[PDB]
Amino acid sequence: GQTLLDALNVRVVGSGERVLVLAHGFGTDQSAWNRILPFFLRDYRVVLYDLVCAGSVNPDFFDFRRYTTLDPYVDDLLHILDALGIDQCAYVGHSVSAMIGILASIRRPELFSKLILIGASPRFLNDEDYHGGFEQGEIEKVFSAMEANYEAWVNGFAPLAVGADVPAAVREFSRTLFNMRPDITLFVSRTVFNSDMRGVLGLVKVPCHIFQTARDHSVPASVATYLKNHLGGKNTVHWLIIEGHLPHLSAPTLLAQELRRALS
C-alpha cells in the first residue's frame, strides 16, 4: 500500500480538486509528462507514477512470474488509487497505459469519469480483417535486435518512435529507454507487442477520447477508428495532423491544448 506508493515513485501535485492521472507508456517514466504538466497544475490534482518496468523503479520489484499479462499492471494502478483515497478521476494513458486504463475501467466502472488514450493500439499484429501494422516476422526482428545489441536497438528505435525531427524528444525518449534493464525491456516488449485487447473493448462503458497522429510508426491511423467503433461507451477521436508516436514529447503545446479540450 504505502510500500507500492514508494516503489512506483507516486507523485501528487497541483492546486485543483478534480483528480487527473497521467500514466506513461512503453519506454518512458513519469518524466515524459514534464512538458505538459504545468498546464494542469491550477485546475487539477495530478497523480503521476512509474510502471514497474520503468528504469526509475528498482528492478527487484519486477516479478517475471507475475507480470506476464496486463492484469497485474492493472492491480498496481488500482492499488495506488485506493491507497490515495481517490473515488473518481480522469485518466490519461499513453500506449500500454491506455490498455491498462481500459482493463481498470472494466474492473472499476465508477472510478473513471473518462479515459484519454494516446498512441493506443489493442493489437499490433495483422489479422484477417485487421491492420495492426506488423507481421509476426517483423515483431520477431524487434525482439532479436533488442537482445543482440540493446544500445543499437534504442538508437535506431527512438527516432522512429518520435518520428518528427525533434532532437530534444529523441534524446529524452532514448534516456528513459537506456535507463531500463534490457531483460525487462525485452520481457515487457513480448507482453505488449504480442497483446490482443480487441475482445474486451465493448465492456468499457466510460467515455474514451482517442488521440491519434496522422503518421505513427507503431499505430496505423485505422486503429483509432477501430477503437472508436469497438469501445463500448461514447467515444471521441482527436486527430493530430502531425507525425509521431510521442506527442507529449514532440508536440507538447498542441497535445496540452487538445487534452484541455478533451477534459472539458
List, by residue number, the catalytic residues.
95, 216, 245
Whether residue 189 contacts residue 220, with contact meaning beta carbons closer than 8 Å, is answered with no
SS3 44: strand
> Which amino acid is residue 86, in one-letter code?
I
- How many Å from the N-terminal Cα to the C-terminal Cα in the chain? 32
Q: What is the C-alpha to C-alpha distance for residues 53 and 39, in angstroms, rounded to an integer?
A: 27
Q: Which of 168, 205, 193, 201 is nearest to 95 (CA)?
A: 193
β-strands 89-94, 44-49 pairing:
unpaired
Alpha-helical (H) ranges within the chain are 2-7, 71-83, 96-107, 136-148, 150-162, 167-179, 182-193, 221-230, 247-250, 252-263
Phi-psi region of 147 (alpha: psi -120 to 50; beta: other; left: phi over 0): alpha
